[PDB]
Amino acid sequence: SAMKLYIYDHCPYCLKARMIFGLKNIPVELHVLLNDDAETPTRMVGQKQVPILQKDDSRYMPESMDIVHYVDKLDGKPLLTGKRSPAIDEWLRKVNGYANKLLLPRFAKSAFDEFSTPAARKYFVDKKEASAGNFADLLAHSDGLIKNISDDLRALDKLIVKPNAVNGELSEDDIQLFPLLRNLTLVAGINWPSRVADYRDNMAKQTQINLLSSMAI
Numbered sequence: 001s002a003m004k005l006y007i008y009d010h011c012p013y014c015l016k017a018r019m020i021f022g023l024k025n026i027p028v029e030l031h032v033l034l035n036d037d038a039e040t041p042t043r044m045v046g047q048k049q050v051p052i053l054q055k056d057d058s059r060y061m062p063e064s065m066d067i068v069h070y071v072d073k074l075d076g077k078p079l080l081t082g083k084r085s086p087a088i089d090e091w092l093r094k095v096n097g098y099a100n101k102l103l104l105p106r107f108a109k110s111a112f113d114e115f116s117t118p119a120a121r122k123y124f125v126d127k128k129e130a131s132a133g134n135f136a137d138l139l140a141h142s143d144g145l146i147k148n149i150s151d152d153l154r155a156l157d158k159l160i161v162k163p164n165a166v167n168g169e170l171s172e173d174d175i176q177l178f179p180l181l182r183n184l185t186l187v188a189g190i191n192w193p194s195r196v197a198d199y200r201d202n203m204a205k206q207t208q209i210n211l212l213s214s215m216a217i
C-alpha cells in the first residue's frame with residue numbers, strides 16, 4: 001500500500017483527509033504543495049485544489065469527504081459509524097462563519113511548508129487579504145474575536161460527550177470539528193474549556209496530527 005496525500009498543512013479539508021489515515025492507522029505519504037502551485041493540482045484533478053489523494057493504482061481523487069469515505073470503507077470495516085449531532089452542525093456553521101478572521105492572518109505568518117518559498121507566502125497573503133480583509137486590521141481585532149471563540153468554546157464544552165469522540169462514538173462530527181480545533185491552537189490567548197481541551201488532545205493523538213501551540217501568535 002502506497003497512497004499519497006497532496007495537501008497544505010493549514011488547510012482544514014486536508015486535515016479531514018489526514019484524520020482518517022490516523023484513525024485507521026493506515027500509513028500515507030504526505031506531500032505539501034507550495035500554495036502558489038496551480039500546475040500540479042491542475043494536472044492531477046483538473047483545477048487548483050487540495051487535498052488530492054493518489055490511490056494505489058496511481059489515479060487521483062479530490063474532495064476531502066470523498067477521500068474520507070473511500071479510506072474508511074477500504075478494509076470493509078468503517079470507523080465513522082457514530083451518530084452526528086444537529087447541535088454540533090449548528091456550532092460549526094457559526095464558528096466557521098468567522099474563525100478565518102483569526103486564522104488567515106496567522107497562517108500567513110507561520111512556518112507551514114506550503115509557504116516555504118516567499119513567493120508562495122506572498123501569493124497567500126495577497127489572495128487572502130483581498131478576500132478576508134487587511135491582515136493588520138484583522139489582527140487589531142484579535143482580542144474581540146478571541147472573546148467570541150472562547151465564549152463559543154464554552155458552549156461546545158457542554159456538547160463533548162467523551163474525550164475520544166465528540167458524540168460518544170467516532171463520527172463524521174469528529175472529522176468536521178477537529179480540524180477547526182487544531183487550527184485554533186495557532187491562536188494565542190484562547191481560553192480552552194477542560195472537556196474541549198481534553199478532546200482536542202485526545203483526538204490529536206488518535207489522528208497523529210500536530211497541535212500548533214508552539215507556533216501560537
Ligand SMILES: N[C@@H](CCC(=O)N[C@@H](CS)C(=O)NCC(=O)O)C(=O)O
Pocket residue numbers: 008011012013048049050051062063064065
Ligand atoms: N470541497 C473541497 C474544498 C477544498 C478546498 O477548498 N481547499 C482549499 C484550501 S483550504 C483550496 O484548495 N483552495 C484553492 C486554492 O488554494 O487556490 C474539499 O472538501 O476537499
